[PDB]
């Protein structure tokens, strides 16, 4: 057959850890599988001149930016080669600003970028299927906007006048972005009662 | 036939996520199709000297500007090659001014620019 | 016939969006048609040294000026090649002064300049 | 067969030390096993120009960064070669900031990175079993977050307003991230008192 | 057989000192054993430009760092060659900060790194 199909058709579900509600496959499992497929394969962690230090011949193994921190890993399995970028994140999967990261945070990110680079080849690609690309955790923020506009538009459709800002005041929400899933679910409850009852 | 028509005539609707009311195909589906069609294909994320740092030999993987942030991805499927530009945004379609972005936002934008670059080839163009 | 006539005699009316009272053809449609007429065609977004930063080897993908912002796109369909300039504009079609633009504004302008560059070839010229 | 399978199929469990609840195989054992497999093999510790000093021809054996400290070890067993990144950590497995490390910390890190580099080859591959992905200490500290949120929510369910920062003020913890394990137990005692009697 | 197995299968327990509850084999014994195995071997103590002094052509025999002090020893027994890193420690096995070490501390560290470098070869690995 081919490397991607062979590697893609494997179950890496047994060797996974559920931390923060995400699925992670161990690097050691990944190291073994590839080693079996190819006895001689290369893993290279890119090194980039660190900005603040700016010392000649000095190349730390990770990007350092005011915006944050980046890592890069290039896995060459057989002839095929490929690379992956990753964001350094807290144990709560939150970003780390310049000067708040620890070496331990960088090594964990380096190991995670390795399995992600392996995921490019068929092995365990389904581990990142539909979770890595989009914002899986929250999709009601916009839904809330549609439902407040439905309220406003229905209110105008009925009579008098209706405005989104006064509707937001019902929810008493300072910022739509700054709204907890728990509060937004409570918000839906407020709106559905105003709109659904007059619909049903 | 041809690569565009073959790739264009596929249904990527099943593997889509509705976030902010927009339809997105997961990079995993795009990556697997590119591998099947072509076993050896290249994805390259362009690196540009970051402005503020201005350190010699210092190349971050994304554009940093007072106006905002840009990413670039070049996908070479078979002989054909192509590139896509993307802004770095919030989870919602909102811009990130200079100094308000996180490394995670840049990563998500990089992955999204990949599927968009794949969308240039026939696969899932109707979504994008 | 001729490439301009072959592309000029098409109806892109169905794939259009009426925003602000103007008619726009989506890039998805424009990009696919260029592939349909030519499997291998090139789209290049010009990069110009950003003024304020003035960092060596630093090239942003759009012009930055005190007067405002400019983008450029060069579409090579078959042998024919051509380029289009456009001003980056707000969602109300108003100008953006230096330091008031967001990366998202630039990417939207880049996509719009693409279809306008395609409009130079026969496809959808009547709209633009 | 092949080097990875032969090396992978070994029991290094007997020669291990349980410190901090993690499993480590001693370098002495790793040095002999490889030596048997290959009489002539090379271990190289990379040297990088130290930033602050910035003296010409001055190369320390470890990375020094404001973010922290990094070490690198390249083990060439037979034809195969490979490299490992390890973050210098306290005896409590915590990060060390720039200017808080001691040469002893670096040498211990260097030895540990060696066995991890050996682990890339089949020997010692399973001992970690992705030991990096589960910290095994953050989850305990994370439970405190679940229990303070339980106290905030159940308080808000009682109808008495509670905020996480004021609930944290009960524990008087400056950084919920860094708290001694005895203090986590002491904090749990505070929370479980005010929370369990309602739960019951 | 082979050098590691021959050297590994020896009892260096008799020539050891119990200081601080640790076991150390004296260098004198290590120098003789290797000399017997190989009449012509080499011991090299690496020299690194000392930071603070920063005098041209000035090379001290040990690393000096704000974090602390490092030594290096490379033992070439027969064809085989190898190197060891030892951190300078107090008589209580505690670290010495920059400016608190004495030349005596460095020489003791250098001798100890030698036996550890010898320990890489089969001789007395069980102790180290």
XYZ file of C-alpha atoms in Angstrom, chain C residues 57-126:
70
model
C 14.761 41.935 4.938
C 11.374 42.928 6.467
C 8.699 42.837 3.698
C 4.980 43.125 4.678
C 2.401 42.026 1.996
C 0.747 45.496 1.673
C 1.745 49.190 1.217
C 1.599 51.327 4.390
C 1.390 55.129 3.866
C 0.399 58.194 5.979
C -2.250 58.767 3.249
C -3.510 55.181 3.759
C -3.031 51.547 2.593
C -2.578 49.847 -0.808
C -2.554 46.202 -1.957
C -1.411 44.601 -5.202
C -2.272 41.256 -6.811
C -0.806 39.821 -10.054
C -2.810 37.021 -11.741
C -1.128 35.092 -14.573
C -3.883 33.157 -16.443
C -2.277 31.055 -19.221
C 0.372 33.196 -20.990
C -1.532 36.437 -20.155
C -0.471 38.273 -16.944
C -1.879 41.429 -15.263
C -1.989 43.359 -11.925
C -4.539 45.381 -9.881
C -4.096 48.069 -7.148
C -6.814 48.648 -4.535
C -7.275 50.832 -1.386
C -7.881 48.953 1.908
C -11.395 50.086 3.042
C -13.756 49.779 6.080
C -16.926 47.609 6.161
C -18.776 50.850 5.183
C -16.457 51.353 2.157
C -14.639 54.302 3.836
C -10.838 54.901 3.802
C -8.560 53.726 6.676
C -5.857 56.195 7.844
C -2.305 55.106 8.820
C -2.549 53.154 12.129
C -6.310 52.449 11.935
C -6.251 49.238 9.821
C -6.485 45.636 11.122
C -4.844 42.570 9.499
C -8.408 41.330 8.757
C -9.034 44.504 6.697
C -5.872 43.764 4.664
C -6.776 40.111 3.914
C -10.286 41.091 2.774
C -8.756 43.718 0.479
C -6.280 41.144 -0.842
C -9.078 38.716 -1.710
C -11.129 41.478 -3.349
C -8.120 42.644 -5.430
C -7.786 39.015 -6.668
C -11.315 38.907 -8.177
C -10.717 42.418 -9.645
C -7.459 41.101 -11.195
C -9.510 38.149 -12.556
C -12.060 40.741 -13.802
C -9.293 42.141 -16.060
C -9.523 38.803 -17.975
C -13.018 38.381 -19.466
C -14.585 36.703 -16.381
C -17.140 38.995 -14.610
C -15.833 42.274 -16.066
C -19.430 43.620 -16.282
